[PDB]
Coordinates of C-alpha atoms and ligand atoms in Angstrom, one line a residue:
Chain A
X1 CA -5.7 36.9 -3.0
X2 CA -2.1 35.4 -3.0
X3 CA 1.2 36.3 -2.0
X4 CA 3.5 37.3 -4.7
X5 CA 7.3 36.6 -5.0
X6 CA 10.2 37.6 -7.1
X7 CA 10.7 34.9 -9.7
X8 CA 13.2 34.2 -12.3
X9 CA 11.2 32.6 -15.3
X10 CA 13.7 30.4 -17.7
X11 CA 13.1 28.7 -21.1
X12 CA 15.7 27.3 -23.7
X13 CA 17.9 29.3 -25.5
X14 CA 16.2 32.2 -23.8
X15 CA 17.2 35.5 -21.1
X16 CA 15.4 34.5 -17.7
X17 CA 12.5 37.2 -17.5
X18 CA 12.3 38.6 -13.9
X19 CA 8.8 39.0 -13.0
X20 CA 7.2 39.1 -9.7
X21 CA 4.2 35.8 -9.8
X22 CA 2.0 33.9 -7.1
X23 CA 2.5 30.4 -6.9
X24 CA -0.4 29.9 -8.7
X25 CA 0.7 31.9 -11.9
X26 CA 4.5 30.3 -12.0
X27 CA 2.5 26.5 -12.3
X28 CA -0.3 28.0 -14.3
X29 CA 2.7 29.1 -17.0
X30 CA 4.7 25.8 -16.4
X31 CA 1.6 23.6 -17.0
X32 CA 1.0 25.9 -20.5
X33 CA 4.2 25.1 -21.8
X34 CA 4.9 28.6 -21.1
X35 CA 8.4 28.4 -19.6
X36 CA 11.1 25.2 -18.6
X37 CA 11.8 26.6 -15.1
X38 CA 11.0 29.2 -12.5
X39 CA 12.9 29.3 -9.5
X40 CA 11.0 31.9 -6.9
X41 CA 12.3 33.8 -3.5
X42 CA 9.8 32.3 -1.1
X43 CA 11.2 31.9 2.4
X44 CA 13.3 35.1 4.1
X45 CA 16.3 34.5 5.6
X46 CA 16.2 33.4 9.2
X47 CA 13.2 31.9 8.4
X48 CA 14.4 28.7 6.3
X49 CA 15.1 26.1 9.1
X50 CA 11.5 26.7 10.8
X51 CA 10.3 25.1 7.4
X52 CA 12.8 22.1 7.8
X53 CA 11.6 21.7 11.5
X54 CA 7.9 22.1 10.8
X55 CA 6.1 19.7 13.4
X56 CA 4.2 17.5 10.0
X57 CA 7.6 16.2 9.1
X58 CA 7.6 14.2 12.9
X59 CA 6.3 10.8 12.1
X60 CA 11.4 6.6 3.5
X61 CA 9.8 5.2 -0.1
X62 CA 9.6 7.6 -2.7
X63 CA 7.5 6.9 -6.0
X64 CA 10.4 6.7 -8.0
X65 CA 12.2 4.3 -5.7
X66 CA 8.9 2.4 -6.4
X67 CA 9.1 2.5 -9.9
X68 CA 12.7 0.4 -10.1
X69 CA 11.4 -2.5 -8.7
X70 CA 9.7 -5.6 -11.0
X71 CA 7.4 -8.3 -10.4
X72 CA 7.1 -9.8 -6.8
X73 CA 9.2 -7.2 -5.5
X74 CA 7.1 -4.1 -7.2
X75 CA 3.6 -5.6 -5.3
X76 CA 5.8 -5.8 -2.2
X77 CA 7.4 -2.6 -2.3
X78 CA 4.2 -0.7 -3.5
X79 CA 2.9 -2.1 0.0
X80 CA 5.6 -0.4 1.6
X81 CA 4.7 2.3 -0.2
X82 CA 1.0 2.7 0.4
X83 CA 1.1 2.0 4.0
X84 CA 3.9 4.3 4.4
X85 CA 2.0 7.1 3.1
X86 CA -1.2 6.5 4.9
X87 CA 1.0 7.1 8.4
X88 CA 3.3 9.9 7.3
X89 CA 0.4 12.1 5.2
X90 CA -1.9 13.6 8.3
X91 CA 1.3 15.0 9.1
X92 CA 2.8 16.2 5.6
X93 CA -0.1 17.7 4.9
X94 CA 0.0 20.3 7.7
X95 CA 3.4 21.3 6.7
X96 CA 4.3 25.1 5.3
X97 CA 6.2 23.6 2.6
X98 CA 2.6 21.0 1.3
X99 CA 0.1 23.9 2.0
X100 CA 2.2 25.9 -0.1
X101 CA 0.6 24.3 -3.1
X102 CA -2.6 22.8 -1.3
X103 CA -3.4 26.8 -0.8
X104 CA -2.5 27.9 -4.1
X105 CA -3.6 25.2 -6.4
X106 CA -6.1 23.8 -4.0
X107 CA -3.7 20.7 -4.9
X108 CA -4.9 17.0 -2.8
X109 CA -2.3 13.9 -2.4
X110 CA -2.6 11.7 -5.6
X111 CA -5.0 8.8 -5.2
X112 CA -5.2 5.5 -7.0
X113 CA -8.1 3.9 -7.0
X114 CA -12.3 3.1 -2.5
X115 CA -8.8 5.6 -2.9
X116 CA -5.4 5.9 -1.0
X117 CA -2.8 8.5 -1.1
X118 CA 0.4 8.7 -2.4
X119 CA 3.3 9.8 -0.4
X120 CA 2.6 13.9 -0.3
X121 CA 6.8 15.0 -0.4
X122 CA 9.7 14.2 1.1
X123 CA 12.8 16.0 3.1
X124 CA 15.8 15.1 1.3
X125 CA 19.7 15.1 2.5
X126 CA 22.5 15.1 -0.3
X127 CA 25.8 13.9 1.7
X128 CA 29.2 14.7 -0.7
X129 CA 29.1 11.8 -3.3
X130 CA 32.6 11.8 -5.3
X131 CA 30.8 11.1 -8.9
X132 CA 29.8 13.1 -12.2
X133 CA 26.7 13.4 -10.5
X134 CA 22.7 10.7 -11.8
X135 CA 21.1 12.3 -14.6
X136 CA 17.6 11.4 -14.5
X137 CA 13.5 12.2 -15.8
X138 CA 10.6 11.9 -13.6
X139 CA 7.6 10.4 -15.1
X140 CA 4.4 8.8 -12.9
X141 CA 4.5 6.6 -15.8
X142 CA 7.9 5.5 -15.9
X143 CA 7.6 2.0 -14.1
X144 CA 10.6 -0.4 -15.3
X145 CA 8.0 -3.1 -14.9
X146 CA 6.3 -2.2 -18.0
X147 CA 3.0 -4.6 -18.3
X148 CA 3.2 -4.5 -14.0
X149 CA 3.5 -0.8 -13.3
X150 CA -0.4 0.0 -12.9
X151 CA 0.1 4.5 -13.5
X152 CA -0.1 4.1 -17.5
X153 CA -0.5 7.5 -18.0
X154 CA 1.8 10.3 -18.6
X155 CA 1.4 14.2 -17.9
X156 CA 3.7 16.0 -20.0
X157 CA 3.4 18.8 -17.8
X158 CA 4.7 17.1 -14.9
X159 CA 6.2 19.5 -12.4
X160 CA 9.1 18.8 -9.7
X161 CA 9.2 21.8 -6.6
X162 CA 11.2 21.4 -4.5
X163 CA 12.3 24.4 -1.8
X164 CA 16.4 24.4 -1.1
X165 CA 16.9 24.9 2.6
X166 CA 21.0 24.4 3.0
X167 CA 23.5 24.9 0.0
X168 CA 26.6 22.9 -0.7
X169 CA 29.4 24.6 0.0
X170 CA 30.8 24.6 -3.7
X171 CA 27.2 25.9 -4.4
X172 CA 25.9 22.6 -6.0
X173 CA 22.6 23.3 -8.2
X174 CA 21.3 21.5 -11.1
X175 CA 21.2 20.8 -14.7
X176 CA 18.4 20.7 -17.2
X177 CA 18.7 19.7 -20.4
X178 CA 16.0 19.9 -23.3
X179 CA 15.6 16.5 -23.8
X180 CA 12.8 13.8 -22.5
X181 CA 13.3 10.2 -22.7
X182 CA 10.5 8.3 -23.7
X183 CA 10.3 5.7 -21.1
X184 CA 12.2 3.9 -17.9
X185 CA 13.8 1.8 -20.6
X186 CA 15.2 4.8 -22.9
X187 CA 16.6 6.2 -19.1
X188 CA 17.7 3.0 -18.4
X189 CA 20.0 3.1 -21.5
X190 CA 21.3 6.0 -20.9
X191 CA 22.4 5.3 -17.7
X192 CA 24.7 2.3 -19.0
X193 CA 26.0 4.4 -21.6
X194 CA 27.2 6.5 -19.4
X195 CA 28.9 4.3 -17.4
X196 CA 30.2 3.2 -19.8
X197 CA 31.8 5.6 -22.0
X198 CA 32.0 8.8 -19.5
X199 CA 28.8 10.4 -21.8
X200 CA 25.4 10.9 -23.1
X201 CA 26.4 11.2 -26.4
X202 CA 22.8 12.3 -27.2
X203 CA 23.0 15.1 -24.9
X204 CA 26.0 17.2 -26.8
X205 CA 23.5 18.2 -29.0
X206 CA 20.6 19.5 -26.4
X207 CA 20.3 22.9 -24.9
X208 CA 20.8 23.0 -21.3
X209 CA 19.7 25.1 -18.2
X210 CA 22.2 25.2 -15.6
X211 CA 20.3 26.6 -12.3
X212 CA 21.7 27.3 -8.6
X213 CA 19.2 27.5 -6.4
X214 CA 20.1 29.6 -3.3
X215 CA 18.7 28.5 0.4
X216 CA 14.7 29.9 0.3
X217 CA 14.9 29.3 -3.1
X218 CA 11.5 27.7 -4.4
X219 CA 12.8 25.8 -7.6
X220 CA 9.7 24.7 -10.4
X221 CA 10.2 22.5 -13.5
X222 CA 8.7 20.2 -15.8
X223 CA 10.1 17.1 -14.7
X224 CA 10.3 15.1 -17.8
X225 CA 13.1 17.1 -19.0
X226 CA 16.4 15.3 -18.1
X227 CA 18.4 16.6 -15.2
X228 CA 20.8 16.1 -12.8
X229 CA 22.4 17.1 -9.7
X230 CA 26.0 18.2 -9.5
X231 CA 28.3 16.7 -6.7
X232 CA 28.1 18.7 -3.6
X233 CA 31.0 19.3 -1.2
X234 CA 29.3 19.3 1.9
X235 CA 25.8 18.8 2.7
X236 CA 22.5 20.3 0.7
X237 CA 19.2 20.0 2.1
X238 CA 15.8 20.6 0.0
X239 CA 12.0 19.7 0.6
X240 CA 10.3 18.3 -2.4
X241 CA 7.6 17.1 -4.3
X242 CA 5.9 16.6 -7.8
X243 CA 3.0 17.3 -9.4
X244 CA 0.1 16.7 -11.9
X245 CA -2.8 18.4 -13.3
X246 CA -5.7 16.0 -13.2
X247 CA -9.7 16.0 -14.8
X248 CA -9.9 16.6 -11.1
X249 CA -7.7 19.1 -10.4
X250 CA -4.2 19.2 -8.9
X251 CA -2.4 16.3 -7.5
X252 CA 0.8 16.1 -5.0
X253 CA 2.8 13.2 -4.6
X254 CA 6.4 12.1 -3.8
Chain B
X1 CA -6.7 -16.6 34.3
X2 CA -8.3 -16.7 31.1
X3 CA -11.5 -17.7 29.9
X4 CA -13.1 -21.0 29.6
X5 CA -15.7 -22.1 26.8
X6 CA -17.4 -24.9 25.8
X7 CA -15.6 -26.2 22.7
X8 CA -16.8 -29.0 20.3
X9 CA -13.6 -30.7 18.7
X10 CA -13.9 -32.2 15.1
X11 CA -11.8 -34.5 13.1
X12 CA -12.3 -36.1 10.0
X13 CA -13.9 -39.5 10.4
X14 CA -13.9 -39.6 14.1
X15 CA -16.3 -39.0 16.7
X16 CA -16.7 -35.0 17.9
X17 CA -15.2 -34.5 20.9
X18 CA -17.4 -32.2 24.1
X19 CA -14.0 -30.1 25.6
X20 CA -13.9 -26.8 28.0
X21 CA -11.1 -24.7 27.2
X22 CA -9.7 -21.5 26.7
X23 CA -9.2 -19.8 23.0
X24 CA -5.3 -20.5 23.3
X25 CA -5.7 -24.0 24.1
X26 CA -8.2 -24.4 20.9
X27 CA -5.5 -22.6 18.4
X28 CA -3.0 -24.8 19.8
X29 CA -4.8 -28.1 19.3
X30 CA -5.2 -27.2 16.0
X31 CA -2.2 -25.9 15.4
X32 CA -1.1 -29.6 16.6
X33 CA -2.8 -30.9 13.8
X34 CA -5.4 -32.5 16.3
X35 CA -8.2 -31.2 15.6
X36 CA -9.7 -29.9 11.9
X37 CA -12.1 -27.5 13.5
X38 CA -13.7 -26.1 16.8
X39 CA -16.6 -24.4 17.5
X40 CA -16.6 -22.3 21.0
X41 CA -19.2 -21.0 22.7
X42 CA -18.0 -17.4 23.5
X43 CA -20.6 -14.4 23.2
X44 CA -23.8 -14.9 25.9
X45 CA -27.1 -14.3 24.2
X46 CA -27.3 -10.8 25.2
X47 CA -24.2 -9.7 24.2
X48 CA -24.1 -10.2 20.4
X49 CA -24.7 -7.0 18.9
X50 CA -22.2 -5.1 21.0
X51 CA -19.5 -7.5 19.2
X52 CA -20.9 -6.2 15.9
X53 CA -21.2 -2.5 17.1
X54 CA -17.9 -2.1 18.6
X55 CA -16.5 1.0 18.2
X56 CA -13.4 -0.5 16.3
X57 CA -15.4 -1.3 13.7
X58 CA -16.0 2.6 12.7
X59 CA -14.8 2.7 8.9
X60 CA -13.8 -4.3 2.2
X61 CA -10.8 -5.8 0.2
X62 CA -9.5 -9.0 1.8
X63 CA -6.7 -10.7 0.9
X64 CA -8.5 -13.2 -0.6
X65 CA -9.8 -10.9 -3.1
X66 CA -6.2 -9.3 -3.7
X67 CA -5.3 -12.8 -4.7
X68 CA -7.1 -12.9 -7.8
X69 CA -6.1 -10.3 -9.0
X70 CA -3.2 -10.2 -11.8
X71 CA -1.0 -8.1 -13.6
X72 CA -0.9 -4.3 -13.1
X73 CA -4.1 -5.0 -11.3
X74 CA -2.4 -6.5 -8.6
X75 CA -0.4 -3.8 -7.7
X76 CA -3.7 -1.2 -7.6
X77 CA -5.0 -3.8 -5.6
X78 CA -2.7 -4.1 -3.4
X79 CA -1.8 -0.4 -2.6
X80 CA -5.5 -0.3 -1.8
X81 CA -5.3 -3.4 0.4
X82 CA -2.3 -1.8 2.4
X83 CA -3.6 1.5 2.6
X84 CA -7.0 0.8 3.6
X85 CA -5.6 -1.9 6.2
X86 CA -3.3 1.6 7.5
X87 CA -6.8 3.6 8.0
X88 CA -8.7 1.1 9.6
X89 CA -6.3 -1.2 11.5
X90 CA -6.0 1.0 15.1
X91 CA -9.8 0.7 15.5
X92 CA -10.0 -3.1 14.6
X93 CA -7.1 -3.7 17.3
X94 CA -9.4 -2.3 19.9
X95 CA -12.3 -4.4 18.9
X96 CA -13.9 -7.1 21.1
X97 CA -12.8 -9.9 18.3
X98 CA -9.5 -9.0 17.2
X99 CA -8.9 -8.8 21.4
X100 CA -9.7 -12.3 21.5
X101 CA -6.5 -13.6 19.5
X102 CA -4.2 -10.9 20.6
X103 CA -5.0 -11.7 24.3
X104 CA -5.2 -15.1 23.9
X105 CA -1.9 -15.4 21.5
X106 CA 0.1 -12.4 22.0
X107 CA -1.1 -12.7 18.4
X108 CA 0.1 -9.6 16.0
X109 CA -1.2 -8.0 12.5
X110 CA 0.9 -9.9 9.6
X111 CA 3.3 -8.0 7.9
X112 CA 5.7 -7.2 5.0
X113 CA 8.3 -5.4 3.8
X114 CA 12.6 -1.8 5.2
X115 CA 9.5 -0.3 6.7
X116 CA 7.0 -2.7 7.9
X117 CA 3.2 -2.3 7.2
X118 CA 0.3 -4.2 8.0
X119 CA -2.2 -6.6 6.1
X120 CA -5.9 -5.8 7.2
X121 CA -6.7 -7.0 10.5
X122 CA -10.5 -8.8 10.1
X123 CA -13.7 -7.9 8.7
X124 CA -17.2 -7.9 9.5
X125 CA -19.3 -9.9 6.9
X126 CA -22.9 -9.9 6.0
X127 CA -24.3 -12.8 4.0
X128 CA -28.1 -11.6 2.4
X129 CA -30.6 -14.2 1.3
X130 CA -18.0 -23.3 -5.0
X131 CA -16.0 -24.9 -2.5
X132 CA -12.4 -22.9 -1.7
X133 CA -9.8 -23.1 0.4
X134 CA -7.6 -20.5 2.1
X135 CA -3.5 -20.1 1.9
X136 CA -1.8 -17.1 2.6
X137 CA 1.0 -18.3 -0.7
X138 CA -1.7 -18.9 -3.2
X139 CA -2.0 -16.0 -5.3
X140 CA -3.2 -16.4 -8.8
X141 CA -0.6 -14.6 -10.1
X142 CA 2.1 -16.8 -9.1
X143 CA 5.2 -14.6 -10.2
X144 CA 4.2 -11.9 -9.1
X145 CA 2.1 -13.2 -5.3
X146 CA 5.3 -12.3 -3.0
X147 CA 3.9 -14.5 -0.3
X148 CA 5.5 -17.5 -1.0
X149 CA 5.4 -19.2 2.0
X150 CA 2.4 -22.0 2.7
X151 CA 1.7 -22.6 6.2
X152 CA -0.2 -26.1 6.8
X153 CA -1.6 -24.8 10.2
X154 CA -3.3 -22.0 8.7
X155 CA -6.4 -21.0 10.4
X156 CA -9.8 -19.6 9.9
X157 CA -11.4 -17.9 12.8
X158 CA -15.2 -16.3 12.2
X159 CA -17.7 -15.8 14.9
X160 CA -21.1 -15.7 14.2
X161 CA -23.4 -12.7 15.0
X162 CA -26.5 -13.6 12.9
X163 CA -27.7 -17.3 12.0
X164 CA -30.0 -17.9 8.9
X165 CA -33.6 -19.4 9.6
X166 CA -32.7 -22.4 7.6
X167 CA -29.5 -22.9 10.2
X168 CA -27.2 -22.8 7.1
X169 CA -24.0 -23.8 8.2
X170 CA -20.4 -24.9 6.8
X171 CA -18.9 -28.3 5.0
X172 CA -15.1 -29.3 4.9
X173 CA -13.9 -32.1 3.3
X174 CA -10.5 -34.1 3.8
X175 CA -8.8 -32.2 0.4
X176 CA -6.2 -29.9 0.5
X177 CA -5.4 -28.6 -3.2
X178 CA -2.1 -27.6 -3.3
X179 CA -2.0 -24.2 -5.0
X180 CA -4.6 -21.9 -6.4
X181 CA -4.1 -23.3 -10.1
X182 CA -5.1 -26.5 -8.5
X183 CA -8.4 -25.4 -6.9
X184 CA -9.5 -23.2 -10.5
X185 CA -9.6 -26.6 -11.8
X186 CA -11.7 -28.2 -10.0
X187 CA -13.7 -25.2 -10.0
X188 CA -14.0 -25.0 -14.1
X189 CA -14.4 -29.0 -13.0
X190 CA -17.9 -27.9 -10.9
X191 CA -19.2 -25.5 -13.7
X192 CA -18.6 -27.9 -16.1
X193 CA -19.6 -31.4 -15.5
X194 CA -21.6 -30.7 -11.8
X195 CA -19.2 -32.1 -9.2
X196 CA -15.8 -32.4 -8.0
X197 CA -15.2 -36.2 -8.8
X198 CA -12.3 -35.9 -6.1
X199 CA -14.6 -35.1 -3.7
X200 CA -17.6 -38.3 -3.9
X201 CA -15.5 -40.2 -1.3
X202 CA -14.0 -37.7 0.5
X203 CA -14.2 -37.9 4.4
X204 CA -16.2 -34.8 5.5
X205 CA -17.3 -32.4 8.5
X206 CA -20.5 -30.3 8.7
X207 CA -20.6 -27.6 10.9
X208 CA -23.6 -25.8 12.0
X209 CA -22.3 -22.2 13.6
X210 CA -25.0 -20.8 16.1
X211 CA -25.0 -17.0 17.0
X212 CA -21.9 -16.7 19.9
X213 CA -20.2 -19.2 18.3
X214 CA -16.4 -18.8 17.1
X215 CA -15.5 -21.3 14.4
X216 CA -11.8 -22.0 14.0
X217 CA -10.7 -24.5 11.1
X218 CA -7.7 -25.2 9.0
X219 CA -8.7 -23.3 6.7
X220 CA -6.3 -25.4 3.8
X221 CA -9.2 -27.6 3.5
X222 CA -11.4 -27.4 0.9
X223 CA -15.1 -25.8 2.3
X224 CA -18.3 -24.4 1.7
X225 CA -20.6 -22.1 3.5
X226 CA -24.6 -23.7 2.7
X227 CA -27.1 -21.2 1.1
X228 CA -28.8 -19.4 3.6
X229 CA -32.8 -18.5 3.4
X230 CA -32.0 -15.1 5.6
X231 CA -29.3 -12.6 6.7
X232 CA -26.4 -14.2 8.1
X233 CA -23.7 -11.7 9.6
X234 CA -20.3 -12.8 11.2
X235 CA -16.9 -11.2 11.9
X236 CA -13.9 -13.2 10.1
X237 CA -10.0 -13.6 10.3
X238 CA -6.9 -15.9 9.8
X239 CA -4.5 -16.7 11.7
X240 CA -0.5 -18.3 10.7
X241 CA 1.9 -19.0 13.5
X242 CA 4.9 -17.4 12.2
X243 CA 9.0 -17.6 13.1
X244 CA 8.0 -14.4 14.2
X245 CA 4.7 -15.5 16.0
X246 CA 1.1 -15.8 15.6
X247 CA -0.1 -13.6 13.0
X248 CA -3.5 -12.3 11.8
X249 CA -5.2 -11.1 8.6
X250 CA -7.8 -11.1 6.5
Ligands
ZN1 ZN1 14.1 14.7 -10.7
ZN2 ZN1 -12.3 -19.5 4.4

């Protein structure tokens, strides 16, 4: 039996229902289509930087650094990738933050595929950036290589998780809007029209989700939803990863 | 003070040569473009199957196979090739055989990449009861292969465990086809008419690889292992000598 949490459950349009959920129900109810976001009160205060400093981070590509790259750089970068992952898992996988999910979900790494692993998740730093901030989907689909990228599938219940452990000091969060591009190419687009003209023009007419995830905040979403980042003031630090619910159960990757 | 072995040197259209030297002086001679092969007399009789057992060996793509592969497939294939190579590559650094090169070289894994990671060390091959030639740069998939380099020098290095009854050994011929479009030719050439015509006046070298024996060629040339009536087992890599060093993979 698990550990429950208080959680703040979020759709469109919607008040956020407070409920108190396991880990397990909050990405049982994501991967229904049940709500857009849950962001959950997992680590006490006092306790956040023992997750950061957790000895499995020790010893970066991530997946969707992969996916940007085309043709002889894409077989040389997934390389990188692969044999990154193999070094950098045995520890990742002993982490709090990875067995947080390997415990609930009995999640494994993602293998392709003899089988490999994906990277498991990642530490991330956000230094102060002076932009908009950066609007983004994640998709294990979402190769700009189209005929190249070898993950031809798409999970429409793809989650990001990702566990804040410093806060911006202008209290940076994210935004989520209800709207999912249909490919790297459709992302791609909207990226130059932003630059562009200042705006997503097909955005003023989507619902959005403004979240503020607070330090020991655990922060759960379907990832094909665009969202974005906002400019931080000084620097925010979160653990994160994604995942997908496979014919053979859970899968973690970064 | 390294070791010394008895070494027969081979060179298209001349006489074999009888030599005594050590495993660097052999690379280097080829790698001089003075010899084509060189078959060494390393592993005593009683001493084979500790070469195969090694402990190193506790753990199947080559490179060779990730060449021929296209497309999306490539890029499966190769994050299988790297992250098999990841698992098993701090064993096969230990073993007997990789020791040999990396003693006798200062000879490292190839690499690639930011981050560097490493291509598959060697592997150990069993042969149970269409001539080609090796080139790191000579990926079918052209535009996408990212190893565009060819090195002339490159080597093949196998030593041989097991020998088949019928003493099957190993052909080269002087003919170096120049990509791996070239050599699918004269391969749908072979299926289709019986021969390589290129080949019917081609200087050649036969090679006849005894248990013990390390075999080291340029492995550019086109060759052909003979049928064998029984099990044949050897343990196989390939060596470039890069700006960085000598290299290994397989
Ligand atoms: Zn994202
Ligand atoms: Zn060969």
């Amino acid at each position: 039996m698990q550990h429950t949490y208080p959680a703040q459950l979020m759709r469109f349009g919607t008040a956020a229902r407070a409920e108190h959920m396991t880990i397990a129900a909050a990405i049982h109810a994501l991967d229904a289509d049940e709500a857009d976001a849950i962001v959950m009160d997992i680590v006490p205060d006092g306790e956040r930087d023992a997750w950061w400093d957790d000895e499995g981070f020790s010893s970066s590509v991530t997946l969707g650094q992969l996916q940007r790259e085309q043709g002889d750089k894409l077989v040389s970068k997934a390389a990188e990738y692969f044999g990154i992952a193999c070094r950098v898992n045995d520890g990742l996988r002993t982490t709090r933050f990875v067995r947080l999910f390997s415990d609930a979900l009995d999640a494994k790494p993602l293998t392709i595929g003899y089988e490999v692993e994906f990277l498991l998740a990642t530490r991330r730093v956000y230094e102060p950036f002076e932009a908009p901030f950066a609007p983004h989907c994640d998709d294990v689909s979402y190769g700009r290589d189209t005929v190249n990228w070898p993950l031809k599938r798409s999970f429409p219940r793809q989650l990001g998780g990702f566990l804040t452990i410093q806060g911006a000091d202008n209290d940076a969060g994210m935004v989520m809007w209800d709207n999912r591009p249909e490919s790297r190419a459709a992302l791609d687009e909207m990226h130059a029209e932003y630059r562009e003209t200042g705006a997503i023009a097909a955005l003023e007419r989507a619902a959005k989700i403004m979240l503020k995830p607070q330090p020991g905040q655990l922060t759960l979403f379907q990832s094909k939803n665009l969202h974005a980042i906002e400019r931080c003031t000084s620097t925010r630090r979160t653990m994160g990863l994604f995942l997908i619910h496979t014919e053979d159960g859970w899968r973690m990757f970064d």
